[PDB]
Amino acid sequence: VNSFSGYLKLTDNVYIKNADIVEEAKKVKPTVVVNAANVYLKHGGGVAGALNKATNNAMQVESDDYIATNGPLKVGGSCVLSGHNLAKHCLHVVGPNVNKGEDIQLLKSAYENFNQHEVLLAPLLSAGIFGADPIHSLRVCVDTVRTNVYLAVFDKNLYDKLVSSFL
């Protein structure tokens, strides 16, 4: 048993809810929250800017030190950093950004990072402002992630569309 509440069960291991991932993280304090990162860990908008703002910019300070030491992530890659006041850990995962021209086949590689963690609170990757079809992103998630994933879908109307269209 875990602390996640009000999720619809899609599969053996994937759950979904209409929720702000920031508010969900603050309430649950999960072991792992996933950030929808870019390779530079520049947290400007969407999940990254919202998560970073909720940490009072501590996520960005930590991320800048990580990049100064290690250089950029790969598209499809990840790193584990602090969860600050939101979670024990933040798994920063880089899905492909369609609005920058990246290979959508890299979305599966991105979701494979989740399999290194038993339980995660996460957003849909590569959708929203990254520009991918969220219905596709949910299908890749279900077909790739084997660990227990709790998906927070910010957009109300999209949540309803994802549930109604789920196969």
Ligand SMILES: CN(CCC(=O)O)c1ncnc2[nH]ccc12
């Ligand atoms: C943007 N995005 C993913 C798109 C969606 O889920 O519709 C988010 N996902 C979950 N929580 C969030 N808080 C702020 C944004 C945000």
